[PDB]
Design a protein around this nucleic acid. Structure first.
Ligand SMILES: [Mg+2]
Ligand SMILES: [Mg+2]
Ligand SMILES: [Mg+2]
Ligand SMILES: [Mg+2]
Ligand SMILES: [Mg+2]
Ligand SMILES: [Mg+2]
Ligand SMILES: [Mg+2]
Ligand SMILES: [Mg+2]
Ligand SMILES: [Mg+2]
Lengths: 114, 88, 95, 56, 274
RNA sequence: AACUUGAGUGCAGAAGAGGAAAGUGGAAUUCCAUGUGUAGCGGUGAAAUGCGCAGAGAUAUGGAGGAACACCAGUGGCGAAGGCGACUUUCUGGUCUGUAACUGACGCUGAUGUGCGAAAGCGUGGGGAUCAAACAGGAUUAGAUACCCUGGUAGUCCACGCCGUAAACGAUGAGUGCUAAGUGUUAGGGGGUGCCCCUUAGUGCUGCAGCUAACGCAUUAAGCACUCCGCCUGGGGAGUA
RNA sequence: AAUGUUCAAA
């Protein structure tokens, strides 16, 4: 529980998830818009990101680590307002990563909406 | 199919000694060599179809040239069939 | 009449006498009907650019084989897969 | 004018992959057409023997 | 392949026999035929235990081996011969010592050198060697279960299990029916896929060609008057009424898992049928 | 009888997702295994059905299994057409350029037959990962059998065998000659100094002459000539009896 | 990214 952390966030169009962990994948304190009472498509605002990175980041209480090293899953509208506002708990962002799973034409997508 | 020199092992052995091929008696030999070159291949690939019209087209031209040599003398045609075995 | 180049990797976690044993057997497999081995090159251990089989390193070997009847290298292509000292391999023709 | 390219060439292809791990287009690089056909049949069998990576 | 019969007679109309193409029929040679009496499903007392057996054609048991001895000693496959006992074909080999014995036939072979117990022997078709020497991914018939006995697994016409991987004292081999079972690491296991592939494509058509095999006709439940079968006689035809279908000896027969609790193999079963 | 321009055969080289048969690899989806963790994930215009403390989704490792091959990739190439795009090997068709050594009109078109022929469908087999008719559940409206969402069977996948249709479309049959010019591009071949102009073959645009009802086509003709075949004769009724 | 039907007789 001692002073480390990698940041795994995703942001689809619904309920941008923030979950910070250690060098392994062990689940310090996950956080969502859904733990906060956002349901009517305020599940994903940049204001929903404004209370996303805060209530996971400030809920360290065992590590309070030195850097965060974000890994950006989920191409969606809550990206950079969850990484600027991650700094508001005082954690010293210094290098960012963007990992969204790009297929190589594996499985055919679901059909087009109308 | 036939290689270069194997074609050379079949071209010189039919035509008259003109030292220049492309005769109405040497083209039949290399065409039949190309047929039974490829017609053994179509035994093991009975799924293939783009190879088969290349077979059938040159069978067409062979039936043209063996129905051109009629108009000159049949004595070329008769023993020319008797050596390089075709039907009819 | 067909310049078969083969090249293959050997697992890093062996002992060196077995490493110079595999280069002796597989250049005898190619020695059946024309070896023509102009280079048995131990172009050595590097870090290959990604990871395979939890092995970060590998032992390359570059072999040139010339032949006509082209039966020979398919013995290698059968027998190299079934073993597990060779994580990847290639044969490639050139004329 | 540079001669033909095999996948034993360790680094000659690396100047023509992007920094991330993808090919450059002919529009971006500015070579001929045939040369980059030799690139696209060269660098893929480079990837098959792991001399050049997929994704950084 | 199979050959089919032109409908000339109203029994023959749809019957399709197996056509014997690869057979190289010698008269089955004298030194291995062992005399087999029929027995029609009546045990040592004399009363009928399992039903539906009876007078087939008079068969003759051909002793084949499975506990393959003779390490490092070769064999030539002479001829493929028909067998009436089992469903796969059989094959005769001749050792270089000069001994004759049968083995069951893999998919493709007509002559050649195959060796047995070949711990250093290349894994071609029909080649047979102990189990931990096999690389992962191949197919395999004729598998032992306890070492040195003679295989009980994948001997039928066409079936072949395959190795998923290893443990160190066991492996994880997955069978034909979909189970995944650990077996002990030192077991003979003949490589390949056992032959005679179109055996279930036959369509025997006549009533007699099940009666020649030795299968007497059954009789359904809901025709018997109700002291012989629980779907007893009703007025007319009758729905089965009782809240499941049942066996003649009063057990449920439609979806009731029956294996004896523990019996010292459940720690080996990894994944059952699906 | 001969000749050689039409078409063929030789010689050199040049390309190409043309096909058929084995083999190898990477990204991704899903479902199993176990770590950490706890109150929701997912969902739309908004919401619910569905999954969740018995331990979800987010994440760490690992396994299994099938499908398609991001970047290159482009009015780019190849095939008669449908079409074909990871990589290597085995077999094999076709066209282009230059060259003049032969053969000396051997050619064109094709009535009936003979064959190839997307996608769905059918038969006996296997395979089943994502999708996904019928259907089932929740909203929407007055009702909604629909568009929306959560699931899901056939099928989509491979071998063998049928069916033989489509906006199978440049809505433009096939062959051969002839009449301004610019302008890209692909595969070559010669001339003069990595660059500058000569012609052949395809393939895009802009454009006179000419035809055209007009839109527009215009050296890849819908222009000017010939040769052969297929087809129409007002729309409904009808591609039906 | 909508929830919106119809207009008796030439
Ligand atoms: Mg009765
Ligand atoms: Mg009773
Ligand atoms: Mg009744
Ligand atoms: Mg009853
Ligand atoms: Mg089907
Ligand atoms: Mg749906
Ligand atoms: Mg089309
Ligand atoms: Mg056009
Ligand atoms: Mg009419």
């Amino acid at each position: 529980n001692i002073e480390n952390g990698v940041a795994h966030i995703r942001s689809t169009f619904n309920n941008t998830i923030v979950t910070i962990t250690d060098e392994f994948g062990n689940a310090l304190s996950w956080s969502s818009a859904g733990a906060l009472g956002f349901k009517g498509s305020k599940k994903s605002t940049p204001f929903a990101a404004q209370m996303a990175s805060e209530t996971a980041s400030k809920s360290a209480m065992e590590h309070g680590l030195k850097t965060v090293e974000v890994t950006v899953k989920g191409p969606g509208p809550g990206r950079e307002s969850a990484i600027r506002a991650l700094q508001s708990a005082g954690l010293e962002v210094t290098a960012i990563r963007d990992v969204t799973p790009v297929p190589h034409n594996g499985c055919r997508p679901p059909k087009r909406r109308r | 199919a036939i290689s270069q020199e194997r074609k050379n092992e079949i071209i010189k052995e039919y035509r008259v000694h003109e030292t220049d091929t492309g005769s109405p008696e040497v083209q039949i030999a290399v065409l039949t060599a190309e047929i039974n070159a490829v017609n053994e291949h179509l035994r093991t690939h009975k799924k293939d179809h783009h190879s088969r019209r290349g077979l059938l087209k040159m069978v067409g031209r062979r039936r043209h040239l063996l129905n051109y040599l009629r108009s000159k003398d049949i004595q070329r045609y008769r023993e020319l069939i008797k050596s390089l075995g075709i039907r009819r | 009449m067909r310049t078969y180049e083969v090249m293959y990797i050997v697992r890093p976690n062996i002992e060196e006498d077995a490493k110079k044993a595999l280069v002796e057997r597989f250049n005898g497999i190619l020695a059946t009907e024309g070896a023509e081995v102009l280079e048995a090159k131990d172009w050595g251990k590097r870090r290959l650019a990604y990871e395979i089989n939890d092995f970060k390193d590998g032992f390359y070997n570059i072999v040139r084989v010339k032949s006509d009847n082209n039966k020979a290298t398919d013995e290698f292509q059968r027998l190299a897969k079934i073993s597990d000292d060779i994580i990847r391999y290639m044969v490639i023709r050139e004329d | 004018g540079i001669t033909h390219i095999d996948y034993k060439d360790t680094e000659l292809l690396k100047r023509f992959i992007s920094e991330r791990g993808k090919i450059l287009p002919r529009r971006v690089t500015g070579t001929s057409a045939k040369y980059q056909r030799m690139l696209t049949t060269a660098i893929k069998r480079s990837r098959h023997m792991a001399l050049l990576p997929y994704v950084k | 392949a199979i050959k089919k019969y032109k409908p000339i007679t109203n029994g023959r109309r749809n019957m399709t026999s197996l056509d014997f193409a690869e057979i190289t029929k010698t008269t089955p040679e004298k030194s291995l035929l062992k005399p087999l009496p029929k027995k029609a499903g009546r045990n040592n007392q004399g009363k009928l235990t399992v039903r539906h057996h009876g007078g087939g054609h008079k068969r003759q048991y051909r002793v084949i081996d499975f506990k393959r001895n003779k390490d490092g000693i070769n064999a030539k496959v002479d001829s493929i011969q028909y067998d009436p006992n089992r469903s796969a074909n059989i094959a005769l080999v001749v050792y270089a010592d000069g001994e004759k014995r049968y083995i069951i036939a893999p998919k493709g072979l007509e002559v050649g050198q195959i060796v047995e117990s070949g711990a250093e022997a290349d894994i071609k078709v029909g080649n047979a060697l102990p189990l931990q020497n096999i690389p992962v991914g191949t197919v395999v018939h004729n598998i032992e279960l306890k070492p040195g006995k003679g295989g009980q697994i994948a001997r039928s016409a066409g079936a072949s299990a395959q190795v998923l991987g290893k443990e160190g004292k066991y492996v994880l081999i997955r069978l034909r029916s979909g189970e995944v079972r650990m077996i002990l690491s030192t077991c003979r296991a003949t490589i390949g896929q056992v032959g005679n592939l179109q055996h279930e494509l036959v369509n025997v058509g006549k009533a007699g060609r099940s009666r020649w095999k030795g299968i007497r006709p059954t009789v359904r439940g809901s025709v018997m008057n109700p002291n012989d079968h629980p779907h007893g006689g009703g007025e007319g035809r009758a729905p089965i009424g009782r809240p499941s279908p049942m066996s003649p000896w009063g057990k449920p027969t439609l979806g009731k898992k029956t294996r004896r609790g523990k019996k010292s193999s459940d720690k080996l079963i990894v994944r059952g049928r699906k």
